[PDB]
């Protein structure tokens, strides 16, 4: 009895800086975001005026203080690794059947660690798209407010 073929998916993903969604955001990767707690950038925004000569009081310059904050988003990917998997990672090997057994523990851990690292690149694109949808009001509200 035969064994006519043996096949397997290989997953590739276009990461966040190669999609077209980065045309709607600026990407400045920071070293350790755990160092700063809250971002509290304060802006002083001043509007212009038209000088009129009507009977009302004269036009005074105006400032508006706008207080933009930074919203933190946290992401976790869980990875299970077997106990018998890593018991033969530390083990001493010399026979050729234990080189091809050790190749099964280094191709399981590094495939379960490109699992959790792939799941964080899928978590960027989700947690930008979830941000863009929590600040997108619909057309029927914004068309008359935009005018």
């Amino acid at each position: 009895e035969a064994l006519l073929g043996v096949y397997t998916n290989v997953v590739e993903f276009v990461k966040f800086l190669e999609t077209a969604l980065a045309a709607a955001c600026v990407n400045t990767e920071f070293k350790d975001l755990r160092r700063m707690i809250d971002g509290k950038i304060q802006f002083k925004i001043s509007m212009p005026t038209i000088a009129h000569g009507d009977g009302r009081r004269p036009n005074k310059q105006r400032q508006y203080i706008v207080m933009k904050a930074c919203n933190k988003h946290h992401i976790g990917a869980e990875i299970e690794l077997a106990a018998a998997d890593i018991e033969l990672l530390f083990a001493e090997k010399e026979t050729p059947l234990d080189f091809t057994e050790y190749a099964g523990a280094i191709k399981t851990i590094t495939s379960a660690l490109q699992f959790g690292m792939d799941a964080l690149e899928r978590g960027l694109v989700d947690t930008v798209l979830a941000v863009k949808l929590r600040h997108a009001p619909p057309v029927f509200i914004l068309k008359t407010l935009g005018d």
């Binding site: 890593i86 990672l89 530390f90 001493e92 280094i106 851990i109 590094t110 660690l113 959790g116 690292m117």
Partner: protein
């Protein structure tokens, strides 16, 4: 040469040494603290070598195995590995023997009806040709069921790990705490679907860390003779709910029991059941259905065993 190979295996399984930072000298404090912080920073990054160093910290407690010694006609050679084990210790035998009762062997002592158990009645007869070799070794299968003292004699032990069966004496090894390692795989406890009654099934309760398995041993009458019936339950609802949920399961038995007790009252007849606490399966590790020769058997994983005293319910 071959003695040096073992030197590399023992010195690769040792625990990591505790950091000894000298707090009395000047420069020796600076070079010892720096090796704490050059080593935590290389146990946090997601590289493979940092994960290679992270599993040597092994805070593992161990299973405590019990070596039993049973007659070979009270214990089948065809027992699935992971069967739960009881101990019946009514008296002091002249020899150092022990009577271990699996839940398919305690079906033949009980004589509970095959309408309740359709599949474990065909199995318990094909392994036990008459059922007499069990019942000859207990002279009180009517006086321990009348007074309600059979559950005081059983002690729960744990799943089965090794069965060295012979002609007259069978060596049985159990796992009384922890996860039992075979004798190398991890043996999970195997129950038939005939006995296990779930409580977590319904038509949002909290996903707790842990779910427990209980053992109920229930006194009742069949053919106007004393008998019993042992069932297994599985839930993580805390002890006050499950005792109130087991009383709902046995509503049809108590109402058909005290038709006869309304006639006459003995104080030996009031005690009804007893709930033990066998062990704790971790949460959402679903049991895998298996078949034997066709016997539906739920085998769990990471079942660590506990031991609760038999508390009465009625």
């Amino acid at each position: 040469e071959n003695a040096a190979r073992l030197g590399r295996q023992v010195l690769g399984l040792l625990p990591p040494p505790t950091h000894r930072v000298s707090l009395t000298r000047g420069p020796e404090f600076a070079r010892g603290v720096r090796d704490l912080l050059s080593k935590y920073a290389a146990s946090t990054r997601p590289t493979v070598g940092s994960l290679h160093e992270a599993l040597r910290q092994a805070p593992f407690r161990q299973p405590t195995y019990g070596d039993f010694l049973v007659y070979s006609q009270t214990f089948s050679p065809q027992e699935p590995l992971g069967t739960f084990l009881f101990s019946f210790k009514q008296e002091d035998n002249g020899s150092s023997m022990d009577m271990l009762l699996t839940p398919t062997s305690l079906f033949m002592l009980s004589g509970m009806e095959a309408a309740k158990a359709p599949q474990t009645h065909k199995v318990a007869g094909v392994w036990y040709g008459s059922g007499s070799g069990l019942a000859d070794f207990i002279p009180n299968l009517s006086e321990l069921m009348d007074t309600g003292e059979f559950h005081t004699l059983l002690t729960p032990v744990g799943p089965m790990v090794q069965s060295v069966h012979s002609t007259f004496v069978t060596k049985v090894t159990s796992a009384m705490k922890g996860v039992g390692l075979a004798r190398r795989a991890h043996v999970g406890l195997t129950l038939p679907c005939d006995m296990l009654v779930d409580l977590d099934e319904s038509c949002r309760e909290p996903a707790g860390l842990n779910v427990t398995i209980y053992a109920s041993l229930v006194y009742l009458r069949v053919n106007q003779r004393p008998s019993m019936a042992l069932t297994f339950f599985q839930s993580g609802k805390g002890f006050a709910e499950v005792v109130a949920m087991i009383k709902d399961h046995f509503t049809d038995v108590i109402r058909t029991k005290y038709i006869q007790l309304r006639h006459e009252l003995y104080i030996n007849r009031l005690v009804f059941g007893a709930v033990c606490t066998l062990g704790t399966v971790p949460f959402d590790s679903h049991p895998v259905h298996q078949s034997l020769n066709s016997l539906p058997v739920l085998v769990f994983a990471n079942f660590e065993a506990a031991c609760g005293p038999w508390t009465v319910f009625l």
